Design a protein around this ligand. Structure first.
Ligand code: NA
Ligand code: NA
Lengths: 129, 129
């Protein structure tokens, strides 16, 4: 599924991401734009042979099992395929475990480089939540 | 789809029913419980040969076309079948036209007899919206 900006903001709000670990909704919408262009089916190979999956490009090295990342961990206890569903629940619940692990949203390179320190409120302006 | 109480409250909130024409979310959840038991696929024949459809039991006499209610109107400009979808959008948009037509939620008999004058806030207690 490719989400509209305001549709994803509402969905992320429903799943309890607004101010989760103190990250406003705008931070989460900004991260998803730059990670996946709002596409739940986004996949990208990493140089190290791991793959990033879904709206927030969750990495098979640490977080999910895709059967072809040798010597990786599955800290969210899910098949990476679960992170590609039109249903964003599995991506949100895993994102909560990642952002809670001591590096906050710095775990997302695109958040660090394109969202952090910016007016992220602009990502949710004009949306009914 | 059979909704959970809190799931439907959130969905109705997302579709802009909270305080629509001044009816709190609890009024809408209470009406859906007593009309359909939260089942989007609910259908009931009326004595007059019309049929009520969906989570809010919208009547084919006035509001939707089902092809077998002779001399009825289609004021919501939809096939009644649209009101049975797991997607509550068509039911919500038609419910807005009904509640705006001068009788407010008295259009729903079950609301008048079981919700009106009661502590409807109890229908949304314990829900994350
Ligand atoms: Na893995
Ligand atoms: Na009709």
């Amino acid at each position: 599924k490719v989400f509209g900006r305001c549709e994803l903001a509402a969905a992320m709000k429903r799943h309890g991401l607004d101010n989760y670990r103190g990250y406003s909704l705008g931070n989460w919408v900004c991260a998803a734009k730059f990670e996946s262009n709002f596409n739940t089916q986004a996949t990208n190979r990493n140089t190290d042979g791991s793959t990033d999956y879904g709206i927030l490009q969750i990495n098979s090295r640490w977080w999910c099992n895709d059967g072809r990342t040798p010597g990786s961990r599955n800290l969210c206890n899910i098949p990476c395929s679960a992170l590609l569903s039109s249903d964003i629940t599995a991506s949100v619940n895993c994102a909560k475990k990642i952002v809670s692990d001591g590096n906050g949203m710095n775990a997302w390179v695109a958040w660090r480089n394109r969202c952090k320190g910016t007016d992220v409120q602009a990502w949710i302006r004009g949306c009914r939540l």
